[PDB]
Design a protein around this nucleic acid. Structure first.
Lengths: 108, 94, 80, 99, 95, 110, 80, 99
DNA sequence: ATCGATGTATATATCTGACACGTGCCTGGAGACTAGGGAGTAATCCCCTTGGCGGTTAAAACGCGGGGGACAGCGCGTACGTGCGTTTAAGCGGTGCTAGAGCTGTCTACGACCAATTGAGCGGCCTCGGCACCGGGATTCTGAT
DNA sequence: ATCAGAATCCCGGTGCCGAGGCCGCTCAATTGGTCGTAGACAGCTCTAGCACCGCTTAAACGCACGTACGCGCTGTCCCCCGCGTTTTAACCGCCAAGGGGATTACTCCCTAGTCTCCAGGCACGTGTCAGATATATACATCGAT
């Protein structure tokens, strides 16, 4: 009737990350007294960019292993093979992960 | 009962857009899920500290903008700012 | 058989082979067991206090991951 | 005629990802350590928490051994000595080494 | 006109003149004590807030601050702090 | 008409102001409700920590024949005691030099 | 005379003498000036970002203390 | 008439409390670094900000030099080399050492 | 100063369990509207930062000569990797048991909120003493004597 | 064996400016009621974690041994420090100007909050294929001659 057909706010942003769930978590997160309207959309864009870039590195790392399904080994190799992410994710330890294939320079 | 909300399905959709035929196991999906929660908590901490330091009560988009500029290093943050601007310019319409 | 020797000599040798260590002195086992013991005391005290707050009697994955977060080494893959 | 065979072991362990310590010594060591802080009461353990503890501890020890091996290589040595791991623990962050 | 600009200076004066009768303090050390107490306050309050959020409670009660103070300061320092806090709440709940 | 106003610190018998700590917790957005005994506990913990650092600082100042605390004595007092050092290792102290020390191999003869 | 040349070589040797250093290489000066430049670059970048959020044009002491607080080296003695 | 005098210098400087690097070159260095981020607009500086910057930078550099001194001592030398300070900056990590 | 045994990499078969997809559902996101206060913006004051000038003087710079220490190399001894045969304990299945985790329902103590009151605490100002500096006397290392 | 000289430390004397005390004030802390909901608590139901046991086998272990490597030592040469001289820029004091930080008033838009409705995402199954493992094939790489 008089109620319009519901558009999700993610569809208004053209993004995939859930805007409404993030709005609820900012309301119960209690970081700030009030929650502005454009701020969860901006944050959602930031997460979409981060997940897209990390998944792109993970997909190329999966193509190097000739596998089409992502294992944590692919994330570990994708994360430490990018220096700007290495500054981002240096301090996190990744579960089910190995280390880089790095043998020290005295090989002979 | 318990809903146990996770970002699994959104990770699946963005994965489907960037790489069509690539799948993901459950442990790597949990890795992505806790990763998204962690970067969320850091950005919320930056917004909370900056909102309290300058005597503002609300987080607007400018606060998240300077927060993402502060926490992620280098050009990754700049392209994230570009993504945010393209988000906000389509959010304010319709 | 005392329990600190359950962390065997080939296991620590394998950990050093992952670390790029080519040759290993024989005196390293007691000291490496010492740092492993101090590390485990540090994490287990904090995780047990996180369990003690919730009036529970079982260490869950959430409390051990929070205790690792308070030492500055966050762990992914077990909840947030 | 054996020349060197450690190279296969190091590259095989850096391309494998499995856990390096057996689950039971880590389990009973963890329970003996946990009863020493909770004043004698016995605790139960979820399996995923204990597995996560082993993943974090093994990653931390691997990073500590790479740090001490850089300290060995800087002083002109080639074998890993205990003074190197002691100096590595001091030069690391004061909070990170001991809480 | 100026703002009030509240601080922690006068309590450092009272506790100093109680623990040591004849000892003074400079203004730069007063400012360093002021920033110290604000920092350790922010860590303890952030610890209690995160821990109260993790277990899905919404109130900060004295139990959450108790587990927070045992968690953050290392060793017997926290043990004595627990003792003094219990003595303080023992006096406070009387009236 | 009503009773005489007593400070809540006098109800706790403490020197740090519980009322100001309550005002800081209410405007600090940490939680939506604040329990009654939590600022009392905070006042106790801050009172003991200030007493510890001032006791070490007063002994450190009396060791340097001085009766008025300069930041140098605060730095020396904090870093000599291991238990506080572990807490305060991550904090730089203004006007603070490092502990008077030298590694033992540099001292050649005794 | 470049702007990093205001950091004189007796001053860097004075920093080394505080650090317990007996002898100092002639090559140390360039790298020490470089590490000073990169450290100051990262801190000044953080503080100027904090200033630009507040719509002010002057780096006050509060910006330097917050910018150092977010890198894990909090400084006491200039306000909270 | 030549005697070694480093011991009186180290004993005198480690009991000092004043700022040890000259103030004004540090000031113009901070201004010339500052002009590279605000796109040529001249920013002003309060004095207490530059004083705090000097305090944090000097304590950090002293901590870095003592730890690199532990590295140079470890190799049996007594002189501090650039490879030691570079190795110590790597071993402190990516967040505290490089930035 | 070339060829052969074998460790090492890769293609092929053949499955399983986890994975990606389908289905019912319920609760959380969305739509519309109202109320109230956070904050945006303009105007003004003054402050304190920047800029500049003159002289001082201690610090920087540079050069020179001497010697402490870095570094390459050699012999020795010790301790470590590797191989082989013995053991033992970890892991896997299989059952069983119950403490305690999780949910639900009730209620009350406890905490949010507002208005009047007053005093604790804060800004401004003043005074004298802890401390900064200089000078003279007892003490202490170096290295010639 | 032994101390002149320089250096270090300690002590007496002087001066100054920042600490601590005092006073007015104002707004924030306190008090007293009031109202609503988080959580404490009791209880019940059920998963999963611990305990036990057999069985197998891969992994741990001890020893013998050859040899790689740490370490003391030595010679050489190089580069850094102490000292002396000349230069310079930081520093201190003074002053002016104006950008901008800080405050107040005014206004209005944005967001908290309420209520209804519906659809996205989650629990639960389910069918099928990528990855794991075994097997065969050949390439490279080290060893033999």
């Amino acid at each position: 009737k008089a109620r319009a057909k519901a558009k999700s706010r993610s569809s208004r942003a053209g993004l995939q990350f859930p805007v409404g769930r993030v709005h609820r978590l900012l309301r119960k997160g209690n970081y700030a007294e009030r929650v502005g309207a454009g701020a969860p959309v901006y944050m959602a864009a930031v997460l979409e960019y981060l997940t897209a870039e990390i998944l792109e590195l993970a997909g190329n790392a999966a193509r190097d292993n000739k596998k089409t399904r992502i294992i944590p080994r692919h994330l570990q190799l994708a994360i430490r093979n990018d220096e700007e992410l290495n500054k981002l994710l240096g301090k996190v330890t990744i579960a089910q992960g190995g280390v880089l294939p790095n043998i020290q320079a005295v090989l002979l | 009962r318990s809903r146990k909300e996770s970002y699994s399905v959104y990770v699946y959709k963005v994965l489907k857009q960037v790489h069509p035929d690539t799948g993901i196991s459950s442990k790597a999906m949990g890795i992505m899920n806790s990763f998204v929660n962690d970067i969320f908590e850091r950005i919320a901490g930056e917004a909370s500290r900056l909102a309290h330091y300058n005597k503002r009560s609300t987080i607007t988009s400018r606060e998240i903008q300077t927060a993402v500029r502060l926490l992620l290093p280098g050009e990754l943050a700049k392209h994230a700012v570009s993504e945010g601007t393209k988000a906000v310019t389509k959010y304010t319409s319709s | 058989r005392d329990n600190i020797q359950g962390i065997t000599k080939p296991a620590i040798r394998r950990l050093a082979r992952r670390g790029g260590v080519k040759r290993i002195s024989g005196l390293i086992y007691e000291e490496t067991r010492g740092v492993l013991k101090v590390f485990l005391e540090n994490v287990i005290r904090d995780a047990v206090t996180y369990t003690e707050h919730a009036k529970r009697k079982t260490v869950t994955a959430m409390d051990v991951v929070y205790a690792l977060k308070r030492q500055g080494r966050t762990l992914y893959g077990f909840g947030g | 005629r054996r020349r060197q065979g450690w190279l296969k072991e190091i590259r095989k362990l850096q391309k494998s990802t499995h856990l390096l310590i057996r689950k039971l010594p880590f389990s009973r060591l963890a329970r003996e350590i946990c009863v020493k802080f909770t004043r004698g009461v016995d605790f139960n353990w979820q399996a995923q928490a204990l597995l996560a503890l082993q993943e974090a501890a093994e990653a931390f020890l691997v990073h500590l051994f790479e740090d001490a091996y850089l300290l060995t290589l800087h002083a002109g040595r080639v074998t890993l000595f205990p003074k190197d791991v002691q100096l590595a623990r001091r030069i690391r962050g004061l909070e990170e080494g001991l809480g």
